[PDB]
Design a protein around this ligand. Structure first.
Ligand code: 5YM
Lengths: 288, 279
């Protein structure tokens, strides 16, 4: 019967350990022994990692970002997640640090993640991911097993000192809009296209959007659309959109599948019409 | 007892992680080492993590004039610009002149003021040897009163997505190839200006005409067979070499590598994309 006396000793000192964790007064009491342990393990590992770094306004940085920071190990272990992850997935860092990323991402994105764990510079990473999120328009209203898939654009670097540190941002669900069918044929486009590119919105309806991108970008756009069609949301790189009488403009696009199903695209102009004297496509030539 | 195979694994892990025994003693020393060292990480650690993940820099500018209130050292490894050029200037001194209106609208606090968020792309001056060179910077931040007092606290990052094929140039001299798009009948529906250097035709002299109109007759069958291949090969690339009719150098040997662009949804053929290279 001294066995359970020692057992009470052990978990008294594990609750002690809980009180030693870097969380608020009272947060201890919503934990279980397993999560207490896990959080301690990961606090020590993140302290060991930060100790390897060779080094007032510091708190602006996380405040300046939109998404959250994530540190993934070589074995896909979520080594670190910032607090604001709760604002993007509902799941707080209290319930995520230490667990494996493959337990929280869509099964058809795990290959892409692992390829990322092994035009671009050798060690820069850009990939789209679908993570579990318990958030709705009312807050954290979903229990974990009815969690939905949230698309995150994650960009970061592979740093071995061995990690992959990412900024993971959400794509907002819908100023300048365009609406397409799943074949990307224009069903609607913002009236501001005339002062931006030269096209009347009525002249674009029915036309295929792929005819209006520079060929040098097609591949890229293509890939993005595939993501848009397989994950529900996507964001492109910078690409060239052909103006009416000639030339092109640099732009970026976020895209969301809605609803039977349509595509909504939010476009951000990066530059104004370049090379307006130059005709590139057959349509520019006729309208010239 | 899957519950404490993981707890025994947990305690062994903890033992390995502490710089120093049975379960209670290793967890009692864990406690002490925890008191050796309120958020998970410090703001300094998180700043360095963010800068390890993002090729970016923090800047605080006045909302009314754009005056640079603060800029971090990260701006020089990012923008190739010393803090000499940012301090004492405005954000408008650093951006492309065509981005000034957009930046001014991002800096206005007439609808969204304290605490509100900002998200925008612009082009900033990098360090130039000569005549400014501009790079695309993604800016995200928030409006904050500065103890005529509203300011934007933002981070500007490069390489947020993959870089585009700006040029397609694989040399430093006169272009060797050009990209074209064609319909299913072979009609030029897109061509980039490098065609002027490779075959001597202006883009409008090619658009509307068929590619076979520029191919040597003795080669035409071969060109047509290859094209009928790629519309059947649905995405795969096939190369053909034929005598293109130039405008001044007679018959130029030309390698055209083609593939059909498949609609990612309907799998219909949008067009055929060709890379036409002087062999
Ligand atoms: C994966 C989906 C990507 C779509 C690929 C093709 C899109 C072409 C459709 C539409 C292109 C329209 C570009 C609109 C320019 C307006 C820019 C503007 O002034 N915006 C507000 C200020 O920034």
């Amino acid at each position: 019967d001294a066995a359970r006396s020692r057992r009470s000793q052990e978990t008294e000192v594990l609750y002690q350990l809980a009180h030693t964790l870097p969380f608020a007064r009272g947060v201890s009491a919503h934990l279980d022994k397993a999560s207490i342990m896990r959080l301690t393990i990961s606090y020590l590992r993140m302290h060991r990692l930060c100790a390897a770094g060779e080094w007032p306004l510091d708190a602006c940085y996380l405040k300046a970002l939109e998404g959250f920071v994530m540190v993934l190990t070589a074995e896909g272990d979520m080594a670190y997640l910032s607090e604001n992850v709760s604002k993007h997935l509902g799941l707080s860092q209290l319930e995520l640090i230490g667990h494996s990323i493959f337990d929280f991402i869509h099964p058809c994105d795990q290959e892409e993640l692992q390829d990322a764990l092994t035009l671009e510079a050798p060690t820069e990473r850009h990939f789209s991911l679908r993570m579990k999120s318990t958030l709705t328009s009312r807050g954290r209203t979903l229990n974990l097993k009815a969690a939905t898939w949230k698309v995150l654009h994650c960009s970061g670097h592979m740093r071995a000192y061995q990690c992959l540190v990412l900024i993971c941002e959400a794509i907002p669900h819908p100023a300048f809009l365009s609406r397409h069918s799943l074949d990307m044929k224009f069903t609607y486009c913002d009236e501001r296209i005339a002062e931006v590119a030269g096209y009347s919105p009525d002249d674009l309806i029915g036309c295929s959007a792929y005819e209006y991108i520079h060929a040098l970008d097609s591949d890229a756009v293509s890939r993005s659309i595939h993501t848009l069609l397989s994950k529900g949301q996507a964001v492109t790189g910078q690409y060239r959109f052909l103006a009416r009488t000639g030339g092109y403009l640099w732009t970026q696009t976020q895209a969301t599948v809605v609803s039977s199903e349509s595509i909504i695209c939010v476009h951000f102009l990066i530059s104004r019409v370049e090379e307006t004297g130059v005709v590139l496509s057959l349509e520019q030539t006729e309208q010239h | 007892r899957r519950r404490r195979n993981k707890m025994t694994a947990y305690i062994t892990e903890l033992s390995d992680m502490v710089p120093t025994p049975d379960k209670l003693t290793i967890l009692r020393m864990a406690v002490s080492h925890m008191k050796s060292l309120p958020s998970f990480l410090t703001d300094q650690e998180l700043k360095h993590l963010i800068l390890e993940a993002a090729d970016g820099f923090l800047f605080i500018v006045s909302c009314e004039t754009g005056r640079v209130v603060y800029v971090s050292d990260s701006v020089t490894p990012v923008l190739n610009q010393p803090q000499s050029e940012w301090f004492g200037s405005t954000l408008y001194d650093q951006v492309h002149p065509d981005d000034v209106d957009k930046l001014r609208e991002q800096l206005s606090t007439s609808e969204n003021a304290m605490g509100s968020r900002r998200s925008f792309i612009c082009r900033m001056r990098c360090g130039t040897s000569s005549e400014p060179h501009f790079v695309v910077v993604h800016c995200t931040g928030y409006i904050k009163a500065w103890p005529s007092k509203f300011c934007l606290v933002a981070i500007g990052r490069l390489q947020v997505t993959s870089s585009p094929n700006c040029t397609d140039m694989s040399n430093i001299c006169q272009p060797t190839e050009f990209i074209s798009r064609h319909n299913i009948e072979g009609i030029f529906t897109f061509v980039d200006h490098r065609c002027v250097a490779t075959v001597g035709y202006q883009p409008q002299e090619l658009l509307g005409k068929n590619i076979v109109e520029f191919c040597h007759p003795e080669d035409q069958q071969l060109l047509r067979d290859s094209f009928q291949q790629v519309v059947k090969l649905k995405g795969q690339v096939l190369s053909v070499m034929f005598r293109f009719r130039s405008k001044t150098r007679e018959w130029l040997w030309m390698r055209t590598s083609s593939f059909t662009f498949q609609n990612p949804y309907s799998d219909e053929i949008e067009y055929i994309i060709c890379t036409n290279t002087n062999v």
